[PDB]
């Protein structure tokens, strides 16, 4: 019976994370741009403001489908 408790727990961390995750896009400095490249212990992003940033955290979404 503890199984449903964990799965009901899932309607817990996801809701808060979604709210924050759905702000960067909306926010003006989003600077949606092209990822310069990918690495491993990570992302390298050329923001649409012509700036190259290095992100240690490759990103919230899993890195497998981050095509250079």
């Amino acid at each position: 019976v503890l199984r449903v408790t964990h799965e009901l727990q899932a309607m817990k961390d996801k809701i808060k994370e979604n709210s924050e995750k759905i702000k960067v896009n909306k926010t003006l400095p989003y600077l949606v741009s092209n990822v310069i490249e990918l690495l491993d212990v990570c992302a390298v992003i050329k923001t649409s403001t012509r700036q190259t940033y290095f992100l240690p955290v490759i990103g919230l979404v899993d890195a497998e489908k981050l095509k250079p």
């Binding site: 909306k26 003006l28 989003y30 600077l31 741009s33 649409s48």
Partner: protein, 48 residues
């Protein structure tokens, strides 16, 4: 002033870019009818 370059179903999620700074994924303002928002024409967005 900004130029719209795309739109998406469900949440509109426009990909408008203002002049040349950067593409912004911005939702429509609360007080606008969704019909007016379209693709490839001038519109107005506030900074914050």
């Amino acid at each position: 002033c900004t130029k719209i370059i795309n739109a998406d179903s469900e949440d509109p999620k426009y990909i408008i870019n203002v002049k040349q700074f950067a593409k912004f994924v911005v939702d429509l303002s609360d007080q606008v009818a969704p019909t007016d928002i379209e693709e490839g024409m001038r519109v107005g967005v506030d900074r914050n």
